[PDB]
Design a binder for this molecule. Structure first.
Ligand SMILES: *C(=O)c1ccc(NC(=N)N)cc1
Length: 234
């Protein structure tokens, strides 16, 4: 997360760190007692042996894994979206099963899915979080980073990303001036929007042109388009 700040303990109890080979590579979002939503590209090429992935729930700081609020879980099933296209980056979403269920605490809670036509309108501030790089091509965060980013229209996002195919399966967020954005290591994590004092998983952190550049927004897989598919696992 570029231009964010340190999240407090228990700020985003749905945020999950995904470890492969003892390295935190991607984020994820807890959506039930045993299912995570993440990005397909995180797990592409590494889904045949799901027990190579470890989810750390209730994580705040990577340098304090052994604290009472954290819970580790091996993944025993990974289901990439059947319409995932690697080259075009479309439908960049995946389901990941926890081998054993988690009990909910102040630090571990599921995030609500959107309603199937739910509108998170352009100009509204939503939130992002993760342990990814803090500047483009820089170092990873120790403490979980958070930031607020305003949503774009898909038309405006397409104009700003003419080298990419911005589809209806994507939602974009970023500042005109840059400075605040997701980055490498944050993918698979949430874009969360609040409405009526309830947080909703509006997006899954997917891609962009570098990070934090002016008029180069974060592109997120639009979760409302996959609600029905996600709900079939729960
Ligand atoms: C995921 O690893 C990821 C997410 C977002 C970006 N870039 C921008 N949002 N600009 C890169 C990589």
């Amino acid at each position: 997360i570029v231009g964010g700040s340190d999240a407090k303990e228990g700020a985003w109890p749905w945020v999950v760190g995904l470890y492969y080979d003892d390295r935190l590579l991607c984020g994820a979002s807890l959506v039930s007692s045993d299912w995570l939503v993440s990005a397909a590209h995180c797990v592409y090429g590494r889904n045949l042996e799901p027990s190579k992935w470890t989810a750390i729930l209730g994580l705040h700081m990577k340098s304090n894994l052994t604290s009472p609020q954290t819970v580790p879980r091996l993944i025993d099933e990974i289901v990439i979206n059947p319409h995932y296209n690697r080259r075009r980056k479309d439908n960049d979403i995946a389901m990941m099963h926890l081998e054993f269920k988690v009990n909910y605490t102040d630090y571990i809670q599921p995030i609500s899915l959107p309603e199937e036509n739910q509108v998170f309108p352009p100009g509204r501030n939503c939130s992002i979080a993760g342990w990814g790089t803090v500047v483009y091509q820089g170092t990873t965060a120790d403490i979980l980073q958070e930031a607020d980013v305003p949503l774009l229209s898909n038309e405006r996002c397409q104009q700003q990303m003419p080298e990419y195919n911005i589809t209806e399966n994507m939602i974009c967020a970023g500042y005109e001036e840059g400075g605040i954005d997701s980055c490498q290591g944050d993918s698979g994590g949430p874009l969360m929007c609040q409405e009526n004092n309830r947080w909703f998983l509006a997006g899954v952190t997917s891609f962009g042109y570098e990070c934090a550049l002016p008029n180069r927004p974060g592109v997120y897989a639009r979760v409302s388009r996959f609600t029905e598919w996600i709900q079939s696992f729960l």
